[PDB]
Amino acid sequence: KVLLKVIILGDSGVGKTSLMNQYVNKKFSNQYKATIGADFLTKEVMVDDRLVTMQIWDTAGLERFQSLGVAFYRGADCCVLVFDVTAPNTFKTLDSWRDEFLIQASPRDPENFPFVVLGNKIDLENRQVATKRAQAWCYSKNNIPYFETSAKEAINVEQAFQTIARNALKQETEVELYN
Amino acid sequence: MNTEAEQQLLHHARNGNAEEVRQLLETMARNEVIADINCKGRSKSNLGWTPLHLACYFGHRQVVQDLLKAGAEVNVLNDMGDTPLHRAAFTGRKELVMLLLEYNADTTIVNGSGQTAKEVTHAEEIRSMLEAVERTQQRKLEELLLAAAREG
Numbered sequence: 001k002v003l004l005k006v007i008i009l010g011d012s013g014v015g016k017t018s019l020m021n022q023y024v025n026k027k028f029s030n031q032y033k034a035t036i037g038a039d040f041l042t043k044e045v046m047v048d049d050r051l052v053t054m055q056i057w058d059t060a061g062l063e064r065f066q067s068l069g070v071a072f073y074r075g076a077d078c079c080v081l082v083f084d085v086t087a088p089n090t091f092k093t094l095d096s097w098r099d100e101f102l103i104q105a106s107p108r109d110p111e112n113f114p115f116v117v118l119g120n121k122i123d124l125e126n127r128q129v130a131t132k133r134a135q136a137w138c139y140s141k142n143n144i145p146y147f148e149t150s151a152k153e154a155i156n157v158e159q160a161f162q163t164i165a166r167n168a169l170k171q172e173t174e175v176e177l178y179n
Numbered sequence: 180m181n182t183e184a185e186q187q188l189l190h191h192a193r194n195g196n197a198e199e200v201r202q203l204l205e206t207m208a209r210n211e212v213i214a215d216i217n218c219k220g221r222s223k224s225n226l227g228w229t230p231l232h233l234a235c236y237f238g239h240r241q242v243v244q245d246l247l248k249a250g251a252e253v254n255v256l257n258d259m260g261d262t263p264l265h266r267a268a269f270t271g272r273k274e275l276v277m278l279l280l281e282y283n284a285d286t287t288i289v290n291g292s293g294q295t296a297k298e299v300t301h302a303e304e305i306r307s308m309l310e311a312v313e314r315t316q317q318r319k320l321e322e323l324l325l326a327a328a329r330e331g
């Protein structure tokens with residue numbers, strides 16, 4: 001019935017595509033990253049006694065062109081911010097990814113717009129971004145829920161999208177888009 | 180490019196850091212820093228937005244009020260064509276609209292989509308406010324045109 005649009009954002013190489021395929025296809029593969037990346041990908045899931053169809057948009061196309069981001073982000077219901085726990089430069093950029101999304105997606109209520117932050121690739125060594133640091137940042141931004149994840153080993157992927165959908169569904173129940 | 184000062188102004192206005200905004204404006208007022216108050220964002224996080232657009236959209240009333248008190252242009256346009264009034268009205272921020280209307284914002288301005296601020300809002304009280312002012316501005320404009328055309 002109800003349709004949720006989900007944007008996935010983050011510097012390339014943080015594991016956006018890999019997180020998509022893990023959530024949707026239960027698989028660790030980033031293949032065909034120029035046909036499904038910069039493209040939808042879909043999963044019918046159940047969300048609190050509501051049958052949802054979730055469109056998950058990968059930003060891997062990631063053209064500097066702001067003109068793309070406007071209609072691409074248009075009507076997003078949730079935005080998933082992803083960084084590499086082992087790459088500190090990808091955590092510093094979360095500020096501008098969130099801001100760029102908000103001014104281009106232009107939702108009516110930005111301060112309550114549902115974001116989720118994924119600290120991906122936690123199955124590595126030399127994790128250079130500290131958990132407490134990322135939760136500090138997330139709460140700083142109006143208590144964004146934060147998960148550490150592994151697309152490779154399938155850790156907290158399903159959990160995070162359960163939250164994503166739930167929070168997105170409390171924001172899409174304000175607009176209503178069934179099918 | 181943007182100067183460090185006007186990058187600070189865009190950042191603090193977007194984030195509602197009212198005291199830092201006001202201190203910057205006092206420095207800019209005293210000509211101790213180079214910074215256009217109507218600067219357009221030049222980064223990914225703010226491209227084409229003024230500090231006033233940012234503070235209206237994100238609902239930072241003290242920032243808006245200091246920018247207006249400091250002389251910021253109420254009718255700046257972003258890349259979408261929006262005025263600050265479009266952003267405040269779109270987000271249903273009634274008091275911000277009041278403030279912009281109080282500093283003589285033009286309500287007749289059409290954005291890139293063809294929409295005036297009246298018609299991007301979903302708050303009925305804002306819509307009524309903007310309809311009253313828009314009709315008033317429209318009548319005043321039509322009489323000035325009609326007069327100026329009947330008489331060179």
Ligand SMILES: Nc1nc2c(ncn2[C@@H]2O[C@H](COP(=O)(O)OP(=O)(O)O)[C@@H](O)[C@H]2O)c(=O)[nH]1
Nearest residue numbers: 012013014015016017018030060121150151152
């Ligand atoms: N170890 C590990 N590697 C990952 C994980 N997620 C993605 N990767 C790897 O990191 C690289 C980035 O993958 P990709 O999904 O294409 O990143 P994208 O550009 O952000 O979409 C790929 O080579 C993946 O194999 C993860 O959770 N753990």
